Assembly symmetry: D2
Amino acid sequence: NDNVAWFKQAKYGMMIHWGLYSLLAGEYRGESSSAYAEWIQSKFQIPNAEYGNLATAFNPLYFDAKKIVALAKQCGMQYLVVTTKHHDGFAMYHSKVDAYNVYDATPFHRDIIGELAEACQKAGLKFGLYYSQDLDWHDPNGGGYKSNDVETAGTTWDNSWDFPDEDQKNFDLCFDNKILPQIKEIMSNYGDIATAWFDVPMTLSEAQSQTIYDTVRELQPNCLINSRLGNGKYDFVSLGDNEIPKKPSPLGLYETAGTINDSWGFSYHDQNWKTPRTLYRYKQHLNDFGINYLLNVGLDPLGRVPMMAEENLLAAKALEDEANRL
Amino acid sequence: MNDNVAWFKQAKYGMMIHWGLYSLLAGEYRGESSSAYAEWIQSKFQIPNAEYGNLATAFNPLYFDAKKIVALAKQCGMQYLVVTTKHHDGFAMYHSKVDAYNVYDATPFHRDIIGELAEACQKAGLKFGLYYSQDLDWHDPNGGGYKSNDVETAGTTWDNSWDFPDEDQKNFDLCFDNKILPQIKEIMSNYGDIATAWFDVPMTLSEAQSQTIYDTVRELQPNCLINSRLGNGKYDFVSLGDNEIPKGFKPSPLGLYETAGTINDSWGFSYHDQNWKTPRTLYRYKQHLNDFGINYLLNVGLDPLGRVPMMAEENLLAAKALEDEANRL
Amino acid sequence: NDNVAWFKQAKYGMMIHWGLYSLLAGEYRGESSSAYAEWIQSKFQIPNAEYGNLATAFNPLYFDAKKIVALAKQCGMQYLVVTTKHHDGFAMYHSKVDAYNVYDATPFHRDIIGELAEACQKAGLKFGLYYSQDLDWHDPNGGGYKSNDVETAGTTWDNSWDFPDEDQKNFDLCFDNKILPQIKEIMSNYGDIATAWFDVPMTLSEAQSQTIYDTVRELQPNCLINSRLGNGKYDFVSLGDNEIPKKPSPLGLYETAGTINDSWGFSYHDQNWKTPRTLYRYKQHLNDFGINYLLNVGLDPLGRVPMMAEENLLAAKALEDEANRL
Amino acid sequence: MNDNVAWFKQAKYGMMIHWGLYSLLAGEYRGESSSAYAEWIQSKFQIPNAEYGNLATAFNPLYFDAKKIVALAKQCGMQYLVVTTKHHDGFAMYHSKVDAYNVYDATPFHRDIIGELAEACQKAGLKFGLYYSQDLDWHDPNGGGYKSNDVETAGTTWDNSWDFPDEDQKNFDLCFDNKILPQIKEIMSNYGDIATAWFDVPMTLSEAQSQTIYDTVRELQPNCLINSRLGNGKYDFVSLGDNEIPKGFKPSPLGLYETAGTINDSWGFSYHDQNWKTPRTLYRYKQHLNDFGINYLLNVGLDPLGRVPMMAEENLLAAKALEDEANRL
């Protein structure tokens, strides 16, 4: 597509983390999440019955996709990527296949992904999706259960507390019944999807990885795919910073994702916001190396960009504009 | 007797709880900061009652647990707990017969917070006090404040001057008769023995109205000790305000004194306010007040899920450990 | 002078707090100063022999008046006011009358006020002076000793610890021997002085107040004088914020002084920096009411503008420029 | 015996001290932040030795008091104290015969910090350990690091590649023979019994040179327990690095283990780093390490006046109170 040229020149995007984890805001029964507040269910092994109950309290009165996209646009971000479903397995769109979602399970009773997809269409911002194709703590057969020999931002990679029978788990059950169906949903509704963001597989076959690639290719012909999916199945390489000089990308497309503070999900204890000058300088450094900066905002329980995140994005923009006048 | 006088003389330490619709905004409104006082946020931004009240539809504090809150208070050596029955925004945190603008009728939560705390205290053996905003009520067309705006606040005007912008056609008596006295009767009649009563310094309240509340409390709660703030003849202990603390003055004839503070700089929960007093500051202040025969009433602003903030709990518990250490050495 | 017109249009100035208190940086023997780190000697009643000993450690290797004035200039500040001598009584210039000064008492062995006066001359910034004409904790007969019935940011207003004989103290001794002589020094050397900043007298006669007024008028004909001096003896009223609407100034000249964090002097525990947006908005509000914003920087022990102060001034400038383009 | 082995098994808790020229910059250089590691600041900004060394002329820590530091350590139940004799910047914090780039010869202070701490520990009955950077030395033309820059650091290059930019003409042997071995002999001979010895993992040091230091320490300080970091045959306790802590691995044949941490995120003092671990975090970590037979070596980065930062002292003391409370309950 002309989508390859467009990504080469896009430079700057907004990432959005939002889900049930946002209501706990980095805190559980007087104890801190790790740096990663969105991992809180794994960190404290919160039973699905309890964690899911957060859905009943999810009523973000101040959520406004128009205002979020406007902010992104004012900062010169040319695209927006959003959590359709994180490791906890809660869909932030109206999933036909699973009622564990913002639309069916919450007083809010609205499709977040829908409102953001629309807001982007009208503002002329491309629209990307993140989806956790491997881990699903809500699914009896969610991924992670053949790869716990490594430490996480929680405890185990899988829901080992609600489903403590690793040897009687089968990821295929989860892949066939939830993963592929939900990927079809998000890739079919919500119009043109410019970017697709999957996790590095731990517990899914080359087949399953190839399957998602094909499903995305068929459904969203122009959709650029994050390297994390698999060694043959991508269009741009997501760089982790220590991979940047002073994973072959044949299209020459590169993205580095970061957050303004230290968490992806909202965390009221994390006030360690990168200063405007840090945000601007990092953006400048990545852009000069032909790397897109995908900068994460973790929306708060009322659906708001935290005050200091908004302030710092806007001040970073002012510094950039000032510097482009010289 | 009122052996309640002797008990207050020796109580030394209490928990205060601020909680209401303001807690959901958590010191933030449309990208902008509340003042140090997050509970004033409606006045600060002149949030129309229609919008602010809509917060009630989002109030579902899944983790609220009066037992756990009272247990914490008890573990820190606090002998009583005082709670916001209704703050300046005029939203009742109990099941008010007289006004449906309350936690029970207006919220998914559909529960009486004052009730659960009153019970939790009974069972734990902690006295139970009440705070009520008898003068300001931003929800009431004729709420107080509208004859006293010549002075600055933690918001804008003292009264709801935005929804009700006709200062010259306002009458507080309407509000006093229809909401204030009735609600004070409610909280002073239900929820059992009330050990402490906390009113604001009147701005827009006659001597009559002040005397009326005094009498109502005296009749309903014979042993209830009353905060000086109410009125110059109408109290049992003087609440001291920081600059009134030892190294005009209102006579305390019973010798009873209380200073209220917060752990951070806000009474209501505020995400942006992480300026928690260290355990050593909490302990030292408590010790200083207690040595001058002053009770320390220390405020916790519960978060939107009904939780004591992690750093508030940590700091209370560490302050307790320092105190115990010091009482062994 | 054309100095009246110039102040009406100046809008923005840098204030500098710096002295021995800066080395303690808000901390003494494991205990915190108040919000006002420069009050630390009074707060802990540090004996003059000990506090003065800080002079032996005062070697600010990174002090650079050119760089400080450049920053001020880049932020659009049109003048710079500096502590010649704060309540602790230590002169930050080469005082003939008292060797308790940066030049004579410190390894640094340099005139701070001199270097700043020069840097301002060359950059085309006006140059103002602050001087504590009443309190002097180093002087046996320093002020404050007839007015302790009120609380301070320390303990007593006077040095009541080294000199504990209030009834045998005589401020005239201090006024004649240190105050008037030092005011003559700072008002005679260091060239044109655009602004003069005295404290509200507690313990000095109408005579003594009139005397300083006259001395300034004679020495610095065009020097605009801060209302704090006395009810007949000023050119602009210094406003304290809660005095601003929604002290008659007949020239129509107004100044409000603030700090970026909560302290005037450097305080390593005070990281409560006003955000760029707060600084810019406050400046805008004061300027719209015809009030000059005098914004304080408390230099650190090495003579540096703290990193977050510099960042926040520069970002506030970028926001202002952005807003002036619209 | 070496009853020093039994003593380390039961010691549980030690104070580490970082202090040097880097402490005066306090995590800041020309308007810019050090990394999390303020002590790396010279490498981070490639500060020429002429300039960085000039900091020595400003080093006059009027409030340094080894007695008070050791007293604090003792009150927190720390049984030993380890100190930076010389960090990567190559500045000795003792009176080195072999190199005048030291606190005694180069600074107004004109005093041996290692000496005063060694004495203070003797009198208080605390063991005394030493840290020394045997490989990196940014002051030495032939300092280590110059054959291992393919990996990222808390600064820029591992070696001083800015003052000495001729990697291909550098020879570490020059540095080892003339500065490293001589200085290790100095610190291991003066300052009395040395209980603990802390070297960096070699990058640019032969087996010979590693064995040499081992032997030198063994000869000079028979009872000195040596940190695993030195070399795979040349140690007595394994220093565990966080991700090595229980819920390849190097065998500890004596069963001796140490984990070093800091209270905030820096080893050296940093004005901008106020991210102090809470007392409850300190206590819990100590408890967890101790239960797995691991000693907690907890670092304090002294400020330019030689002071334990106020929040470091507060947090150590509050952590102690929590520990004592928990050991009564």
